[PDB]
Design a binder for this molecule. Sequence first.
Ligand SMILES: Nc1ncnc2c1ncn2[C@H]1C[C@H](O)[C@@H](COP(=O)(O)NP(=O)(O)OP(=O)(O)O)O1
Ligand SMILES: [Mg+2]
Ligand SMILES: [Mg+2]
Length: 341
Amino acid sequence: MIVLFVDFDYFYAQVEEVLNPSLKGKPVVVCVFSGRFEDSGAVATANYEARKFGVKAGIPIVEAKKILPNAVYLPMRKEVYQQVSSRIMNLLREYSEKIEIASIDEAYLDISDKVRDYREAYNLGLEIKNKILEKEKITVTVGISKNKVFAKIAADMAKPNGIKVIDDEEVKRLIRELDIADVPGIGNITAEKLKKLGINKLVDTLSIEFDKLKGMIGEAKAKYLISLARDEYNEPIRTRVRKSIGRIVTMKRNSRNLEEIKPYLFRAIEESYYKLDKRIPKAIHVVAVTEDLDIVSRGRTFPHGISKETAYSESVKLLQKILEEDERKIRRIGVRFSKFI
DNA sequence: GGGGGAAGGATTCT
DNA sequence: CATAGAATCCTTCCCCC
Ligand SMILES: Nc1ncnc2c1ncn2[C@H]1C[C@H](O)[C@@H](COP(=O)(O)NP(=O)(O)OP(=O)(O)O)O1
Ligand SMILES: [Mg+2]
Ligand SMILES: [Mg+2]
């Protein structure tokens, strides 16, 4: 194929820069405040200014304020960003039928039936980067290659405000040279396992007895890596269908007291049903994060859709099944719905 | 042996 | 100190044939 991947640059923070251009050049930090104490919570993302000082997606806000006490700290306005993304996504649908929207700020475009080589594909990418920059004033990064994974690797390398092709011949090179922990899907727990077997490059998975590989990292990840190593990974650009909807909130204080937890759980069901927007679910899961930050959950599938009134009743049973079977106190509580009609 | 699908946890991603 | 939405995977279990 020919895949052109787009990922928006420091997206939530960049949208706050468009809406308030006096922030450009200072470090901007977009925060998810949790309500326990002043500045409790996590950073959703930060602009590249702030990243230079190690403030980035995932770290505590209190930690970010020690490093960069004079950054701008905004609360996340997810709905604002979703609407700007939808507009950018609508802009991208004008460059192929086949488009896979992979998150709030990425899309894969199968542009095979639309250009014939990589310099065509490179030019279309420059076109895409300029429209997005005219219509919405957002800079993005483009990766182009022969499949989705190496398109995404290409943008990862070219960040930020970049465009990069990985032709067939560097896909061969990267199969030998690229640190395997830079392959999408290889997080920290898989990486150290791969390295405990002396696997550092994609090509290294061809010279291992397969079941040692399957034994350590699981059957699906082994075939995934071997597929890329063999330059035969191909996966279609597909339309993504939302398979679950849910909400999880953080409680002012920890607790395993049912009457104390219920209002948070119930807010989370209420919001999930708004979000459900006429989709009807057969499955419900209750998710708790314990005081030691373990995640535990209890669900149930029904033979029929769940009314709101049933979700309320059943999620209290599933939360009690949690409080029965585990002794830790609860820090975060949420509900998730799946198996729509 | 295996179709199925659950359930609970792990891992990764944004 | 440790947000939040969501997918896919693994293991075990179960319930038939
Ligand atoms: N850990 C997190 N927690 C909450 N929100 C997050 C998050 N990680 C990402 N997001 C939200 C906010 C992120 O902005 C948005 C896009 O995530 P990316 O494309 O992975 N990172 P960005 O676009 O920010 O910078 P780059 O230029 O490096 O892509 O998703
Ligand atoms: Mg991005
Ligand atoms: Mg992204």
